[PDB]
């Protein structure tokens, strides 16, 4: 799901 990618990006960038 493309709509989940920015959540992962957010999580890994913390």
């Amino acid at each position, epitope marked *: 799901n*493309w*709509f989940d990618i920015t959540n992962w990006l*957010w999580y890994i960038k913390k």
Partner: antibody
Amino acid sequence: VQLVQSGAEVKRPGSSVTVSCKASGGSFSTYALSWVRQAPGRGLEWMGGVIPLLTITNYAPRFQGRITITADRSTSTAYLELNSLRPEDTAVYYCAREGTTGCGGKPIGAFAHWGQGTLVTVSS
Amino acid sequence: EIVLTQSPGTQSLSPGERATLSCRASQSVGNNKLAWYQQRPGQAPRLLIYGASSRPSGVADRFSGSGSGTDFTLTISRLEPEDFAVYYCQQYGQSLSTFGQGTKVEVKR
């Protein structure tokens, strides 16, 4: 977050239109920007989106081959290009950015932020 | 492609009344990624509910979302004059996002 779109456009049948969306406030590169259109008297239709940092686009099958969505990190601007225009493409085109929850910037996928819309009229 | 059905397409109700609006999906919506938007004539849509039941801080608490799988509901506990508008559901549980065709909540007289 404020999204400001380019002004109304009249386009000839068979031409291509570019609509711009400039974001001011928050972060631009790490949040999903979509384009949604609404023909006169009709419903919302999701066309596609982009995640700028990763350059990952996602187009609705209905528009795959006719649309290009790009993002310019230097100007926090996203662009919609729609090709081979027909009268049926006459619509208000909105840019829509996903919201956040909490104070940490966690994205929610759903479209909290909307531009003012751009009317594209396809006509001779 | 997930088809979202909003039936009925119009509801005629009185100010102060409760409203329940249905969104039925042709297939299960991934992780209940179902949003509701309000749209008034001449205005951009506005997000009321996301993730089936989450409400953004600014949104009136008379709006609530419920449901899961294929069966979602937007509830307006008491209609204010500004609540007479069009309501769209949207799924974003797969890369192809779709909207319902909308339900217009209009004033019965």
